[PDB]
Design a protein around this nucleic acid. Sequence first.
RNA 1: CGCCACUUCAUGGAAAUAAAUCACUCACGAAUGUCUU
Length: 150
Amino acid sequence: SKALLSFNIESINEIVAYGGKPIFIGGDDLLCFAPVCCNGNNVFNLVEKLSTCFDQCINQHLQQYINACSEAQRPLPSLSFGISITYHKYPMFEALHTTDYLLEMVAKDNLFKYTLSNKNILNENMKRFILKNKLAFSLQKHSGQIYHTA
RNA sequence: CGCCACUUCAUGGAAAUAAAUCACUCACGAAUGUCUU
Ligand SMILES: [Mn+2]
């Protein structure tokens, strides 16, 4: 809880310093509206800064668990990111749906899990193939050219 | 000293060889994000 609160405060500070707007940052959830590029920094620079802040807070407040999971060879807490860049006149509801789709379905690999679970073949060996720590990014131009990657 | 002409009329080698084979720029821009009953 201490690590999450510290990360939330530092993420608010970083979003304000970059030049964006914090919508909601609480627990493990973050929602921000930021410029594509301003004062030389990009969106991906902000994402890297947020990931660094999360890692720093995890190290600072969870050092015992980090040390235990280091030699035990177990994954550490991580942040999955979903970035959508759209024209300012593009509907905000569609942009938010695109961001949710990116984050959940691609960045959290919920497409694999959802397709497996709808057919009831999730099992455990298949659950071994759930991939986290992903960045989903999509840029839709004014002509709908949409560049997307993960 | 005199007298006197014939013969021969292109073969062999090289017959193309390397370098560059597209380069840069633009890869959508503006309007409309609902309107009238
Ligand atoms: Mn959450």
